[PDB]
Design a protein around this nucleic acid. Structure first.
Ligand code: NA
Ligand code: NA
Ligand code: NA
Length: 327
DNA sequence: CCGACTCGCATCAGC
DNA sequence: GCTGATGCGA
DNA sequence: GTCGG
């Protein structure tokens, strides 16, 4: 459903969602507007009235009205007022820097810090994460074309294997489902030396390696199971430098790896469909395990999982390739 | 009418 | 010092 | 803001 179809309504709503998250700090209002704006992007019909829209799941009365004012006039008075509000402007913008959330942004704008220049004038009051968000502001808002991701995947599989032949790594996310474009790289790692009933240097030895070969240029966080940081593909000595990109590497107990792979892969709507369908078939699925729901509602022990396919067998579902996992 | 709408890591509040 | 809260991102 | 117990 193209941008000309019902794009104007959707940008409105998303603009409204941003301000609820960034200025009002009303995360559920943020997720509301988003939810409305998303189902609206599904509807294959240039919407003609708020009434029409209200028939959808997630469009309530108040949004129906906003669409009504949008449709009649071309704009929403609330947005325009918000659009040219100084503090709201600067607050909403500053959150675009990774590491600055609405609380930090609101604090910066309190003491006059409103623009990247202001941030740059004040490395002092920026934690480590925020400086990397500043540093890579432009690079981080860029998407990653699939061939770059495919290239990045080469480096990650090669060096991980080179650290140990026992590691298992899967780039998940949209990419794994076939998407011609991604916004970050989501690596799921595991070893046979790591069960849920069990070493605390398994992730550091892969992180280190990828810094030795100068793939990982920066670090936002690293612990015993999650690394978040920056990487960038090597340039041609003549051809321009690639933009730095965000990467996440996550260590998972091998007895839960294929559970996490499915979850960190499958689309949102797919994942609900399956945890909708798993319950009616008597099992419960979270990111970690699959447990059988006993008669009176009580979940039992987690059952073996050793493939993605396995989990479909438990719930009586044909395995679906990640490419066909849109919903 | 009224509550619902996950978690590992950095960092701060408080002891 | 250490525990727990809160922010952030995802 | 929206849904629903
Ligand atoms: Na952001
Ligand atoms: Na941010
Ligand atoms: Na933010």
């Amino acid at each position: 459903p193209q941008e000309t179809l019902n794009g104007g309504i959707t940008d409105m709503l998303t603009e409204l969602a941003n301000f609820e998250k960034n200025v009002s700090q009303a995360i559920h209002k943020y997720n509301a507007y988003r939810k409305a704006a998303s189902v609206i992007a599904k509807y294959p019909h240039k919407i003609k009235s708020g009434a029409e829209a209200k028939k959808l799941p997630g469009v309530g009365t108040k949004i129906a009205e906003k669409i009504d004012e949008f449709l009649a006039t071309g704009k929403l008075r609330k947005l325009e007022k918000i659009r040219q509000d100084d503090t709201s402007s600067s607050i909403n913008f500053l959150t675009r820097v990774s590491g600055i959330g609405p609380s930090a942004a609101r604090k910066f704008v309190d003491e006059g810090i409103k623009t990247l220049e202001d941030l740059r004038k004040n490395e002092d009051k920026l934690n480590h994460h925020q400086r990397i968000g500043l540093k890579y502001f432009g690079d981080f808002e860029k998407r990653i074309p699939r061939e770059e991701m495919l290239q990045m995947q080469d480096i990650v599989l090669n060096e991980v294997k080179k650290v140990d032949s026992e590691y298992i790594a899967t780039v998940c996310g949209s990419f794994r489902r076939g998407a011609e474009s991604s916004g970050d790289m989501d690596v799921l790692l595991t070893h046979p030396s790591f069960t849920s009933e069990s070493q605390p240097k398994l992730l550091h030895q892969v992180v280190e390696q990828l810094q030795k070969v100068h793939f990982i240029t920066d670090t936002l966080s690293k612990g015993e199971t999650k690394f978040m940081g920056v990487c960038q593909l090597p340039s041609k000595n003549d051809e321009k430098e690639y933009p730095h990109r965000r990467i996440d590497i996550r260590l998972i107990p091998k007895d839960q790896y294929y559970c996490g792979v499915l979850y960190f892969t499958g689309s949102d709507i797919f994942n609900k469909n399956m945890r909708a369908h798993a319950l009616e078939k008597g099992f419960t699925i979270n990111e970690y395990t699959i447990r059988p729901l006993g008669v009176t509602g009580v979940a039992g022990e987690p059952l073996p999982v050793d493939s993605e396919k396995d989990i479909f067998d438990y719930i009586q579902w044909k395995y679906r390739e990640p490419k066909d996992r849109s919903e």
